Amino acid sequence: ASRLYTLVLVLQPQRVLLGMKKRGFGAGRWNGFGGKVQEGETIEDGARRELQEESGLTVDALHKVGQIVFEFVGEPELMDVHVFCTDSIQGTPVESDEMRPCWFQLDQIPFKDMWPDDSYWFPLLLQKKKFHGYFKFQGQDTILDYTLREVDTV
Ligand SMILES: CN1CCN(c2cc(NC3CC3)nc(N)n2)CC1
Q1: Which of 5, 31, 144 to mutate to test the pocket of ligand 1 (most atoms within 8 A of CB)?
Q2: CB 3.0 to 4.6 Å from 85: which of 27, 65, 136, 144, for a disulfide?
Q3: What is the DSSP-derived secondary structure letter of residue 146?
Q4: Where exactly are the structural domains of the chain?
Q5: Which consequence is recorded for altering residue 45 to P?
Q6: Which atom of ligand 1 is least distant from the CA of 34?
Q7: Any residues with CB less than 8 A from the CB of 60 and at least 6 apart, and which?
Q8: How far is the C-alpha of 112 from the C-alpha of 147, rounded, in Å?
Q9: How far is the CA of 115 from the centre of ligand 1 (A)?
């Protein structure tokens, strides 16, 4: 069994939008915007909802770019993260209770202050290639196993 999550990257020709997580799971790391998918909403709907709640931004179209499955040792549910990207946003990003947003140049992505898996799959994201990933974590800092492959359909 798995639980559905979303992650949204606003990726524009020269820059990417990340949020510093201010509380809760992953506090203290820069990440895309996202969260749990609710009963009664599509994955895409959930992605737009979390983007709006965390940054105030709305989007015309979200594109599926990846799926990443996480195992945390000792936790029964796998995390099934559906990753989306967009290049056209509506509005200016603003800070929320959960996220403090900032733009980063593509050669200055703060990988040391991100989830360790990002260093593995972000290159594929930046090359506009679709991917399937799997990461086994012990705790929040240690990757024990992983797989990563490019796909034709996410
Ligand atoms: C609600 N959030 C959305 C984003 N998400 C993650 C996780 C992640 N790896 C960690 C599981 C080990 N890496 C990125 N880039 N995003 C976690 C749950």
Answers
A1: 31
A2: 65
A3: E
A4: 1-154
A5: Loss of activity
A6: 3
A7: 86, 88, 90
A8: 20
A9: 7
Alpha-carbon distance of 152 to 118, in angstroms, equals 20
Pocket test for ligand 1, best of 10, 115, 120, 138 (most atoms within 8 A of CB): 115
Experimentally, how was this structure solved?
X-ray
- End-to-end alpha-carbon separation of the chain, Å? 19
Q: Are 150 and 133 in contact (CB under 8 A)?
A: no
Residue 73 CA to residue 128 CA, distance in Å, equals 31
35: left (phi over 0), alpha (psi -120 to 50) or beta: left
Resolution of the PDB structure in angstroms: 1.9
